[PDB]
Design a protein around this ligand. Structure first.
Ligand SMILES: [Mg+2]
Ligand SMILES: [Mg+2]
Ligand SMILES: [Mg+2]
Ligand SMILES: [Mg+2]
Lengths: 59, 140, 108, 40, 148, 43, 155, 153, 71
């Protein structure tokens, strides 16, 4: 809980890679969570002016 | 008696002091500055009105994010937090969501427990079982 | 041992009610990641530029890496490296760089 | 939201409506003398 | 306009009011006249209220200057180094007293737009959110498609 | 490609905008409220 | 009992603790939190507090700005009682919808009574020659919150 | 110098060269401290020092005035004084190793127990930050620590 | 309908107003009954006395509590 300012900010705004399987899956229900993770709308630190956003790899 | 306006420099300067940061000829030409300052002030008031709505939408997005991170939906979380007579607004709920992970996890656990309790009381079809978090506390 | 949320992450939450009835309390200490769920530190240290003939030339060979590249290839290289579009990396005008605040406000 | 549930439980639709969050005087002096009341 | 003017955060200088309260106003200098009719409220404020104001606030220094001036002014200087001009031209005595009390109750910082209505140092009690604070660990710390 | 002739909400040919279930439940709620009102206005 | 995709509901079955054992477990957790609050093992407390029509997340040694004028002199110390939430790293007390006055005492000193920056309110309507411009100067109060104290009484 | 400037010791100081050079300003401020010592009791000067100097660390952490450069070694010495033998760095959480923004979490384990965990861009920086977290928790300077007692005994 | 809403004292929305049960009031309420909500006034503690005029409260289920927030 006690970190310095720069590594605390780096941990808060860290970018995360997600994995997603597309076998026997509807593209709309895939793209709903793909859009959410590309926004970073799963982050409580989300802001539209910030560069928050996560990578998604779909196989 | 001929009368002329002498402080016209200050008359144009009271308009031009609000338009120094504009692009084009609106920061210099007084005819173009007045229409630009007027629309700027009108947009300032209207965006001041929309600021509360935009910040509320941001808070709802943040609460939805931090509640779906625990696997509980936003409307279920809100109504089951209200059903425990905990009245925290969405601003401070997003504030707990950002800076307070264990406390927001406890709140989400309380909301999930209240949701399961309400579903159990609905499927029971009886008034005799009253839960530990379904009891209603009156004012004192 | 009952909990509405799993205790695998964040805090081990224990909810309770005051017997009088107007207070909800909860005990939530951290859960620590145990030794078995971690991996050891990757150790990488190898010097292939060292020469048996001349270490003073070998140390300069490790400082001999330099390259110059044009603007367009530099922009697409930066875009591929940092996973952004190419339109951010282009510079800006005098009017845009002059209206940036020289002393921005700072909190904390 | 949840005004309907508060309506069956007897509270107001709005939490600002006549609750113990509302008619208590939100500040008081540290030594314990009462505050002057609210105009509202 | 927020985009037109400058902005500052909500800041108490020298962490005022934390250990003790220090009235950050230093001095007032009134510039008034004995002859001009616009200095009437300043003259009556000098006659009645200035001595009582000095008894109520022992930490401020009050100077009164009757000089041949047309516009009566009061200049307030603070501990921060801030100087603030105010025109007391042609006002009633209760208006002058309200203006002096409002200048006395201020801290002295620049009156511009405040970005946020709160200030906090160390807001990260019991941690701060990072994307790994709620994600469970895999046995061995494994990646989803990495085999051991 | 396909046009509404004239203005949308005036003419002989209008926009074929349908009724929604939310509007339906709003109407039944308003009917229940006024039915309670005309019960309380009876005696 | 055949297995049908809609024959079973599409949500996992939930089981609930027995009420008397939940009561004893709640008493045990309340006693543990009371032992902790009596031993004083809490580091730094935060509190969600209701004041002047708003709810603020407030930690000690901090500042809040109130948008309305208060009839309190500068440098006076006041007590707030509408504490909706209090907490620290190990524990968190919820109100329903309020906490007791004998449970938590939270205290703030008035720093500053000032006026806000001049805000502009103008309404303009097109080609009817309607323009209204006005300047709003709002009285404001800067408060420094000093201490958050919890008495060890808890049932 | 900031405390003296905001309290306007430089306004009451009698010296040449108006900006009051910082050793001279420090000399004048501690002369005011000594004048308060010969004026009132030592507990009053202690209260004044607590009011006007300990309030200057609000929001500050330990390691931007201590400025130690080897947290690992000093953590080893402090663990020897506390009679715990050897810390071990273990990579707990990571996101990206071939990308331009690598993120690593490094935890410190003594007898297979977690005492600290730290973030970093590089594994070495994360290990140093984990040592900083461990040293901060050992010494009692935390974000979670008790705030200063400003009261009247 | 505007005029009847005006003379019934119902200018401000979402604010209750107490009226008699008489047919004279009931005819106007019949005319504007699609714009309003009517509840009975319930008195569980009876009519308030002159000592308790300032201490009444109106609970939105439709009742008038004579003693509100004692001590
Ligand atoms: Mg409004
Ligand atoms: Mg009003
Ligand atoms: Mg048409
Ligand atoms: Mg058309």
């Amino acid at each position: 809980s006690s970190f310095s300012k720069a590594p605390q900010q780096w941990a808060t705004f860290a970018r995360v890679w997600y994995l997603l399987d597309g076998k026997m899956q509807p593209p709309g229900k895939l793209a709903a969570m793909a859009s959410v993770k590309l926004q970073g709308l799963h982050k409580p630190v989300y802001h539209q002016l910030s560069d928050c956003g996560d990578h998604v790899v779909i196989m | 008696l001929r009368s002329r306006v002498t402080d016209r420099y200050w008359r144009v300067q009271e308009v031009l002091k609000h338009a120094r940061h504009f692009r084009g000829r609106k920061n210099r030409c007084y005819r173009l500055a007045v229409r630009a300052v007027t629309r700027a002030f009108v947009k300032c008031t209207r965006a001041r009105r929309l600021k509360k709505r935009s910040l509320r939408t941001l808070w709802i997005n943040r609460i939805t994010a931090a509640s779906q991170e625990h696997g509980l939906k936003y409307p279920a979380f809100i109504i089951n937090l209200i059903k425990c007579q905990v009245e925290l607004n969405r601003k401070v709920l997003a504030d707990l969501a950002i800076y307070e992970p264990k406390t927001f996890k406890s709140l989400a656990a309380l909301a999930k427990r209240r949701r399961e309790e309400g579903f159990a009381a609905a499927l029971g079809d009886g008034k005799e079982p009253d839960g530990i978090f379904s009891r209603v506390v009156q004012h004192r | 041992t009952y909990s509405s949320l799993p205790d695998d992450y964040n805090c081990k939450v224990e909810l309770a009610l005051t017997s009088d009835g107007r207070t909800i309390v909860c005990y939530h200490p951290s859960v620590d990641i145990p030794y078995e769920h971690t991996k050891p530190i990757p150790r990488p240290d190898p010097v292939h530029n060292i020469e048996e003939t001349h270490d003073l030339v070998l140390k300069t060979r490790l400082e001999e890496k330099g390259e110059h590249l044009e603007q367009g290839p530099m922009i697409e290289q930066l875009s591929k490296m940092f996973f952004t579009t190419k339109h951010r990396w282009y510079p800006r005008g005098q009017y845009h760089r002059r209206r940036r605040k020289p002393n921005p406000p700072k909190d904390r | 939201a949840g005004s309907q549930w508060r309506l069956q439980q007897g509270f107001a639709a709005n939490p600002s409506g006549y609750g113990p969050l509302t008619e208590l005087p939100d500040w008081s002096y540290a030594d314990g003398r009462p505050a002057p009341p609210m105009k509202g | 306009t927020a985009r037109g003017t400058a902005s500052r955060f909500l800041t108490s200088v020298l962490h005022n009011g934390l250990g003790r309260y220090v009235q950050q106003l230093q001095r007032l200098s009134f510039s008034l006249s004995r002859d001009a009719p616009s200095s009437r409220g300043a003259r009556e404020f000098v006659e009645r209220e200035v001595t009582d104001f000095a008894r109520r606030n022992p930490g401020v220094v009050i100077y009164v200057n009757p000089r041949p001036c047309c516009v009566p002014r009061v200049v307030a200087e603070y501990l921060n180094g801030a100087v603030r001009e105010e025109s007391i031209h042609c006002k009633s005595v209760e208006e002058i007293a309200a203006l002096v009390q409002k200048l006395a109750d201020q801290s002295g910082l620049d009156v511009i737009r405040i970005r946020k209505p709160f200030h906090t140092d160390s807001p990260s009690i019991q941690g701060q959110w990072h994307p790994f604070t709620n994600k469970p660990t895999t046995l061995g710390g494994l990646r989803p498609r990495e085999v051991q | 490609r396909n046009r509404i002739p004239g203005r949308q909400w005036i003419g002989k040919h209008r926009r074929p905008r349908p009724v929604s279930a939310q509007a339906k439940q709003n109407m039944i709620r308003r009917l229940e409220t006024e039915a309670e009102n005309q019960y309380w206005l009876s005696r | 009992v055949p297995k049908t995709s809609l024959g079973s509901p599409p949500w996992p079955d939930i089981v609930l603790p027995d009420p008397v054992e939940e009561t004893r477990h709640h008493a045990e957790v309340v006693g543990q939190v009371n032992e902790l609050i009596a031993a004083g093992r809490y580091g730094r407390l935060f509190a969600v507090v209701h004041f002047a029509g708003h709810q603020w997340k407030v930690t000690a040694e901090d500042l809040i700005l109130i948008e309305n004028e208060l009839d309190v002199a500068c440098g006076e110390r006041i007590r707030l009682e509408k504490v909706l939430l209090v907490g620290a790293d190990n524990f968190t007390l919820l109100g329903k919808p309020l906490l007791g006055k004998e449970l938590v005492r939270v205290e703030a000193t008035v720093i500053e009574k000032t006026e806000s920056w001049p805000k502009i309110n103008m309404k303009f309507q097109k080609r009817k020659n309607y323009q209204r411009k006005r300047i709003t100067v709002n009285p404001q109060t800067v408060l420094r919150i000093n201490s958050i104290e919890i008495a060890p009484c808890l049932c | 110098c900031h405390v003296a400037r905001n309290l306007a010791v430089e306004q009451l100081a009698l010296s040449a060269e108006f900006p009051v050079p910082p050793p001279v300003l420090r000399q004048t401020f501690f002369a005011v401290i000594g004048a308060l010592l010969q004026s009132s009791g030592p507990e009053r000067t202690a209260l004044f020092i607590r009011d006007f100097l300990i309030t200057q660390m609000t929001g500050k952490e330990l390691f931007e005035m201590w400025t130690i450069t080897n947290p690992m070694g000093l953590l080893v010495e402090e663990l020897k004084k506390r009679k715990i033998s050897a810390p071990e760095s273990r990579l707990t959480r990571q996101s990206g190793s071939t990308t331009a923004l690598p993120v690593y979490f490094v935890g410190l384990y003594c007898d297979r127990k977690l005492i600290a965990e730290g973030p970093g861009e590089t594994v070495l920086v994360a290990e140093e930050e984990a040592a900083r977290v461990a040293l901060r928790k050992l010494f009692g300077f935390t974000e979670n620590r008790r705030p200063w007692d400003y009261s009247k005994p | 309908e505007k005029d009847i809403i005006k003379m019934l004292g119902l200018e401000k929305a979402h604010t209750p107003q107490v009226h008699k049960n008489i047919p004279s009031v009931n005819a106007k309420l019949k005319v504007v009954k699609h714009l309003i909500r009517i509840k009975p006034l319930k008195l569980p503690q009876g009519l308030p006395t002159e000592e308790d005029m300032a201490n009444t409260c109106l609970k939105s289920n439709g009742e008038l509590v004579v003693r509100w927030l004692l001590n």
